Amino acid sequence: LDGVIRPIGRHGIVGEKASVLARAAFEITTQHLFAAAERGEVDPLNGVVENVLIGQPVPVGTGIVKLAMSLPLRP
Amino acid sequence: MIGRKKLEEHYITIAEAKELLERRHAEGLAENPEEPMFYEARVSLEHAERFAKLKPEQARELKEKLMGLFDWINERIAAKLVDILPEDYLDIRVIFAKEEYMPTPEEAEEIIKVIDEYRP
Amino acid sequence: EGGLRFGEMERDVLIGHGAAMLLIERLLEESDKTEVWVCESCGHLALEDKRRGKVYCPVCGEDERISKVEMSYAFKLLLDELKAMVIRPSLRLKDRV
Amino acid sequence: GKIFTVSVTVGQETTTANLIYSKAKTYNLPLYAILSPSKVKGYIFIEAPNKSAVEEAIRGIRHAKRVLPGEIPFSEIEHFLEEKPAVSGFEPGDIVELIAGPFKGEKAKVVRVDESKDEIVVELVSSVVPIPVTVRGEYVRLISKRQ
Amino acid sequence: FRYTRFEKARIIGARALQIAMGAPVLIDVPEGITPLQAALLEFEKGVIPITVIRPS
Amino acid sequence: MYKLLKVKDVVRIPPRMFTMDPKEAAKIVLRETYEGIYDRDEGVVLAILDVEEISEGVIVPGDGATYHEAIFNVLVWEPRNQEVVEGEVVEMMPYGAFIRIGPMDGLVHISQLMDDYVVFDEKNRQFIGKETNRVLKLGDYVRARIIGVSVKSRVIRENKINMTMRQPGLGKFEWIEKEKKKA
Amino acid sequence: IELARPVIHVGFAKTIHRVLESTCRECGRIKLTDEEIEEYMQKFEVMGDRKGAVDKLIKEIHKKAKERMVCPHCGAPQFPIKFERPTIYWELRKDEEGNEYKHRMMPSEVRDRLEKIPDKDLPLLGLHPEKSRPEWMVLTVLPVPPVTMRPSITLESGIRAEDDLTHKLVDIIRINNRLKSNIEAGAPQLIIEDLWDLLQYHVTTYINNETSGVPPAKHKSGRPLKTLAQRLKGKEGRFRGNLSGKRVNFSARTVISPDPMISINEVGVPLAVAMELTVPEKVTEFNYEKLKQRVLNGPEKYPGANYVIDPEGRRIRLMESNRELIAEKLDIGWTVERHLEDGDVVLFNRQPSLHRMSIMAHRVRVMPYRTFRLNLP
DNA sequence: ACTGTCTGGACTGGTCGGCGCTATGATC
DNA sequence: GATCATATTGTCCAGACAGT
Ligand SMILES: [Zn+2]
Ligand SMILES: [Zn+2]
């Protein structure tokens, strides 16, 4: 994606993820959390892993569906 | 903080609050339970009724002529003057001393002479 | 009388099926659902005093702007562990609608 | 000679010093003197020409852990040998903590200080009414110094 | 315009949740059925009032 | 100080009110939510008048209720510092007098009623002066200026209001007319 | 806990060393020119989305500032700083005769050096002026966790079994109290350094007991204690063991047996399993009679119910004494936790879950025996 | 600029049940 | 004979680093 070959481990795609919680949950927890604390990183919780950890709906499947309904509904 | 945001606000006199509380009392009477509102609303309605110095239309017209009379006054102190309805210089002096302005006696006399009409 | 573990792989198949509400019901609603008070000023966890019947944030104050947020108890334990590790997590609250 | 530090078990420095002194007397160790202040916990001072003598003296004792690899200047331990009252160095108006006595683990404010009777009068800060109490000077510990 | 599986599942879940805590059924349903069954019957009858908001 | 405000808010309407009018259900929910509490920014929330505009519903996961953006008018009463009020004494206490000035009752201290060394009379619950010989009783037109406002809690009864009567022009209406007679 | 002397956080030791190498010792500013500072400030805004670019920029800035031995802001000479694991910093100072000797930088000196860094140079060093000050990486106050984070149990013999964190905090408190008492007693500097090193070791083991170059903290029996770092990482950590995956309620597990007579959409559920697992069904107009019959049957008669929830939200257990009273009290809005019936939807899963087909939804079929039934296709 | 060397890390999920282990030396 | 402080400080892959 970034113009260079990247692995799928902690030094590749997961390592350059913008989410702090997703990075810390996979392989390296202490180092990623401390590095985020040093930089004052902000996690926007736009991913799936962070929403799973918190307990919020994931942005996939039915989580991206928005519903509307007209209130004056009668049988 | 009521709601998400506030669009507009307005300062009303005692008579407008009395009319609104009477409307709410009628709405509560239209409801099935015999209690129209809670203790505070009923107490406010009773106080406004016992201090109903002027009609709501009279209060509104006094407010708009007060707005059109002078520019340094605002809606809040105009409604305060409508509710108090002063008749001399001592009361207006002691209610304007703590305000941001200290008006000279001539404009106070003018205010007295315009609010003298349609008074009880 | 223990329960059955819903591991990471089970979460993976639930995600692949696109069932967000089922994931919420399994991992959160049926396992460790709890509610906490979060301060809206500094993001710290507010304190609820049962003696006085009031909720306030001890570090910053803010006796008024306190909101209740539901989440897993494991996440609260993680926040406590992070605070014990001299790391400050600031929870920025957002309206549901 | 040179002052050396021996790390020992906390609260049992006097017995370890006595055992070291007895061993040096019996086996003719080249030990000059041993100093064990009561305020210092877990550490004793032994004067010897070299640290090898201290290492040979303290070995064979379960309660002597190790000798600190360094030499203490005499000015550092000079104030320990001087005799000063525990009440002295305390001024009224500050906050102190009572280490021992019937008021263990209580914060107090110093009210009156007298060096003649070696006693210090303090007032508890957690008490709803001021009740001055008389306590020994060595029992208190200075938390803060104000006025 | 056709409903996706995720959109249909979300609509059925919302309708069943509404039926569970009120929201009387707009069509005749057999007795003893679950609110999920009532929502499924409503979807089969094409009487659902819930729409889907799509990005534009 | 009575105030009228236009407030836009998101209203949650339960499925049991689906068959009713959206405006009526929104008004009922807003009355159940905001009426009867004290707001820090706006003061005492007295009543919800009507709902002007209502938007279409939005369904969020985990809740079957619909959420609507509603515009409504709120009548509120807010006490401010150094604000003159007119009221009637409703309660008498040894430590002061309580005057009903609206949804809340202020407190005037025993030294604060007038420029005299007034003492309390327990038999009739009245204040009797020494030199002025003035008497305060039930149902008296009085005027006072607020000097203390407490917004510590959202409960209206827990909040306290302190007013003064030391200053000239504050007191009973008969006393005010007596003062104006000399001038 | 108010520490008598400041200690270095083991999780920020490399960052502390990097910042010390990249900052002026006495001047306090970053060892970069004003033009270079401006250029890096403009370059930071361009590359902000990708954290890798920010990391490379931080590394480049640190490398550029490390080689500088004279601060451009004040001209003060600088000396190389050597980092020794875990939290030991050495400064290669120069003697009067030109000899090079290593000077140990105490945590107090490190914190004083870090305090002089202005807020403007913090973004260049990868730190936030309001969120992460450089001096906060040197611990002065240690936050002891709540007792809920470190629960204490009692054994069958009455002996309390404290947590590993509790023992580590006991050691930390004891060492800190001894250090404070020795400081108040005017102890020589040699004792002070020894107690400071002991407190630093205890704090480092408390933060992470698996630090390289550190003997791990051991229990009395010889058990290596696990600390806050071990509670988050690993398979049994907070993330993988409790956050990404956890045990759940309303679940069952038993041996499976073939059943060709049922459809592929159906699963055979034991009667004992069905009578234990419950589905909460709200009382509506079209199912009041069925749920009333379920309540009347009770937990011991299939099809029945085990619990009943009133609209107020409280849970009432159903037994023989009160099954009739609850049944005649049932109304719209109540919740009845009835037993599993035919046609109910359940999740059927086999481990390991290699693909998304490992969990599928079936239809409940109640069978008398004790085994799950799955169709052969 | 290459090249060998030091250091850090992760080690497939679930389930079944069992079997230990969570003080001690020195006064008063 | 009862209590009290104290109790120690396994191969392989990838990134960073002295050496030539
Ligand atoms: Zn706060
Ligand atoms: Zn400089």
Tell me the nt nearest to C9, Cα to C1'.
H13
Ligand found nearest the CA of C57 = 1
Expressed in angstroms and rounded, the spacing between residue C91 Cα and the centre of ligand 1 is: 11
Distance between CA atoms of residues B1 and B3, nearest Å: 6
**CB neighbour list of residue G179: distance below 8 Å, 6 or more residues apart:** G4, G5, G192, G195, G196, G198, G199
The domains of chain B are located at 1-54, 55-120
Placement of tokens 């334990």 in the chain: C77
Distance between CA atoms of residues G323 and G315, nearest Å: 14
- Structural domain including C11 reads 6-86
Strands (E), chain E: 51-53
Q: Taking every pair of C-alpha atoms in chain C, what is the biggest distance, in angstroms?
A: 48
Expressed in angstroms and rounded, the spacing between residue C66 Cα and the centre of ligand 1 is: 8
F152·C95 Cβ contact <8 A: no
Placement of tokens 């938390």 in the chain: D143
Domain containing C33 — which CATH number?
3.90.1800.10
Nucleotides of I under 7 A from a protein CB: 5-9, 14-16
**E41 CA, H26 C1': separation in Å?**
83
Strand partners, D132: D123
User: Which of C5, C22, C25 is closest to C14 using CA atoms?
Assistant: C22
3-class DSSP assignment, residue G281: strand
Domain containing A37 — which CATH number?
1.10.150.390
Q: Are residues F112 and F169 in the same domain?
A: yes
Sort G208 into a burial class: Cβ within 10 Å, 0-12 / 13-18 / 19+.
buried
Distance between CA atoms of residues D30 and G88, nearest Å: 37
User: Which of D71, D64, D20 is closest to D50 using CA atoms?
Assistant: D71
Strand partners, D48: D2
Measured between alpha carbons, how far is residue D8 from residues D43, F119, G198 in Å?
A: 6, 76, 14
G191·D10 Cβ contact <8 A: no
Strands D106-114 and F141-149: unpaired
Identify residue G304 by its one-letter amino acid code.
G
Domain boundary among F81, F113, F140: F81
Please, are residues B40 and F44 in contact by the beta-carbon 8 Å criterion?
A: yes
Q: Are residues F17 and F57 in the same domain?
A: yes
**What are B45's two structure tokens?**
């309605």
**What are D86's two structure tokens?**
């525990």
Handedness of CA E9, E11, E12, E18 (dihedral sign): positive
Contacting chains of E (3 CB pairs or more, <8 Å) are A, C, F, G
User: Which of B38, G266, B90, E29 is closest to F47 using CA atoms?
Assistant: B38
- Taking the CA of residue C72 and the nearest CA in chain A, the distance in Å comes to 6
**CB neighbour list of residue E1: distance below 8 Å, 6 or more residues apart:** none
Task: Establish if B107 touches chain F: CB-CB under 8 angstroms.
Answer: no
Q: Are residues F134 and F171 in the same domain?
A: yes
Identify residue C47 by its one-letter amino acid code.
L
Task: Establish if G333 touches chain E: CB-CB under 8 angstroms.
Answer: yes
G247·C5 Cβ contact <8 A: yes
Which residue, among G8, G122, G132, would best test binding to A if mutated, counting the most A CBs under 10 Å from its CB?
Answer: G132
Which residues from chain F sit within 8 angstroms of residue B2, using beta carbons?
A: 5, 7, 9, 34, 39, 41-42, 45, 74, 76
Q: Are residues F89 and F76 in the same domain?
A: no
Q: Which residues surround ligand 1, an ion (CB under 5 A)?
A: C 39, 41-42, 44, 57, 60, 62
- B1-54 belongs to which CATH class? special
Tell me the nt nearest to A28, Cα to C1'.
H9
Contacting chains of D (3 CB pairs or more, <8 Å) are G
3-class DSSP assignment, residue G179: helix
**What are G113's two structure tokens?**
């050096």
Q: Are residues F172 and F99 in the same domain?
A: yes
The minimal CB distance from F7 to the residues B2, B37, B90 is found for B2
Q: Nearest CA to the C1' of I7 belongs to which residue?
A: G220
Distance between CA atoms of residues E51 and F57, nearest Å: 10
* Domain annotation covers residue C96: no
G167 among annotated binding-site residues: no
Please, are residues G298 and G319 in contact by the beta-carbon 8 Å criterion?
A: yes
Expressed in angstroms and rounded, the spacing between residue B102 Cα and the centre of ligand 2 is: 58
3-class DSSP assignment, residue F86: strand
**What are F76's two structure tokens?**
């509120």
* Domain annotation covers residue C63: yes
Expressed in angstroms and rounded, the spacing between residue G29 Cα and the centre of ligand 2 is: 5
**What are G110's two structure tokens?**
């490190």
Expressed in angstroms and rounded, the spacing between residue C41 Cα and the centre of ligand 1 is: 5
Please, are residues G246 and C32 in contact by the beta-carbon 8 Å criterion?
A: yes
**Helix, strand, coil percentages in chain F from 3-state DSSP, rounded to 5:** 15, 45, 40
Task: Please tell me the CATH code under which domain B55-120 is placed.
Answer: 1.10.150.80
* Domain annotation covers residue C97: no
Which residues from chain E sit within 8 angstroms of residue A69, using beta carbons?
A: 49-51
Method: cryo-EM
Measured between alpha carbons, how far is residue G50 from residues A16, G42, G57, G123, G126 in Å?
A: 7, 16, 11, 16, 14
Please, are residues G267 and G373 in contact by the beta-carbon 8 Å criterion?
A: yes
Sort C25 into a burial class: Cβ within 10 Å, 0-12 / 13-18 / 19+.
middle
Distance between CA atoms of residues G333 and G312, nearest Å: 9
Strand partners, F3: B11, F76
Please, are residues A32 and A20 in contact by the beta-carbon 8 Å criterion?
A: yes
Give this entry's resolution in angstroms: 2.2
Element at B39 (helix H, strand E): helix B39-50
E19·G284 Cβ contact <8 A: yes
Read off the DSSP letter of residue G77.
B
**F104 CA, I19 C1': separation in Å?**
85
Domain containing F60 — which CATH number?
3.30.1490.120
Task: Establish if D84 touches chain G: CB-CB under 8 angstroms.
Answer: no
Counted domains in chain C: 1
**CB neighbour list of residue G362: distance below 8 Å, 6 or more residues apart:** G265, G266, G267, G345, G346, G348
Nucleotides of H under 7 A from a protein CB: 7-16, 21-23, 27
Domain containing F158 — which CATH number?
2.40.50.140
Q: Is F171 left (phi over 0), alpha (psi -120 to 50) or beta?
A: left
Phi and psi at residue C55, in whole multiples of 5°?
A: -120, 130
| Residue B112 neighbours by CB distance under 10 Å | 15
Please, are residues F85 and F78 in contact by the beta-carbon 8 Å criterion?
A: no
Which residues from chain A sit within 8 angstroms of residue C70, using beta carbons?
A: 55
Please, are residues G375 and G272 in contact by the beta-carbon 8 Å criterion?
A: no
F60·C96 Cβ contact <8 A: yes
Sort D107 into a burial class: Cβ within 10 Å, 0-12 / 13-18 / 19+.
middle
- Structural domain including A34 reads 20-65
In chain E, which residue's Cα lies nearest the Cα of C17? E6
Please, are residues B78 and B69 in contact by the beta-carbon 8 Å criterion?
A: no
**Omega of the bond leading into G303 within 30 degrees of 0 (cis):** yes
G191·D68 Cβ contact <8 A: yes
Domains and CATH numbers, chain G: 1-250 (no CATH), 251-277+340-377 (2.40.40.20), 278-339 (3.30.1490.180)
- N-terminal to C-terminal alpha carbon distance within chain D: 42
Expressed in angstroms and rounded, the spacing between residue F100 Cα and the centre of ligand 1 is: 37
Ligand found nearest the CA of C67 = 1
Ligand found nearest the CA of G71 = 2
